[PDB]
């Protein structure tokens, strides 16, 4: 999971 957005 990206640390900079939750958007897929």
């Amino acid at each position, epitope marked *: 999971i990206a*640390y900079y957005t*939750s958007e897929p």
Partner: single-chain antibody
Amino acid sequence: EVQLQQSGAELVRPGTSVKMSCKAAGYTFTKYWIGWVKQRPGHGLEWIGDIHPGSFYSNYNEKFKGKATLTADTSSSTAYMQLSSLTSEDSAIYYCARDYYTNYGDWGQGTSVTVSSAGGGGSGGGGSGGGGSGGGGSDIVMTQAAPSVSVTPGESVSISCRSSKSLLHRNGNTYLFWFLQRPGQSPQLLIYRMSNLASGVPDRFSGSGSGTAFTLRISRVEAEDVGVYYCMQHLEYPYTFGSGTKLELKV
């Protein structure tokens, strides 16, 4: 199991502030985004923002800029939301939810905030904050055409939603979610990425769609299916919900 434990109800005067907590158990706190949701009677569900307790990156719905401030304390695995300068529009139940690969599957029990002249002095001032956002263009409008639907028990029903743009991602997934909120409960995730059944949800529930139009089909409706069904898009910030479809039994 994953648990999110939220702080106690607040009853506070106009003009005060509150700071509420969401204590996380059962998973790695610094790995997953936590989102916050406002449930105000007559106003469905509304997405506030999210935060990554590992990086402290945060993103806000612009509607809440100057209203909500999100923080996290990794020493106690606790996330916080401060609401500043409270008005009667802020009276609502506020939820935290863990974002598991875009699925808001784990929800806190909610913190009730009631603004009233007969209330207290609140938590006191604080870090009023900021952090957003999506690109700053148009938000995705999620429309549920029916505010309610009445069904005979054991018969089946369709709940409809549509999005103002396609929710189809280039990875092939369609970022559409269905939630049910029963009386006195937190929202429950039913279907994730358009057609995937969430753990522990009966396979009486089915999700389908085109990309811009969607159907939650509830086969053989039971008493435990009564509540408000919401669609939500998790494609782009800010995340947005439909206005909700109340299912009632015609018993």
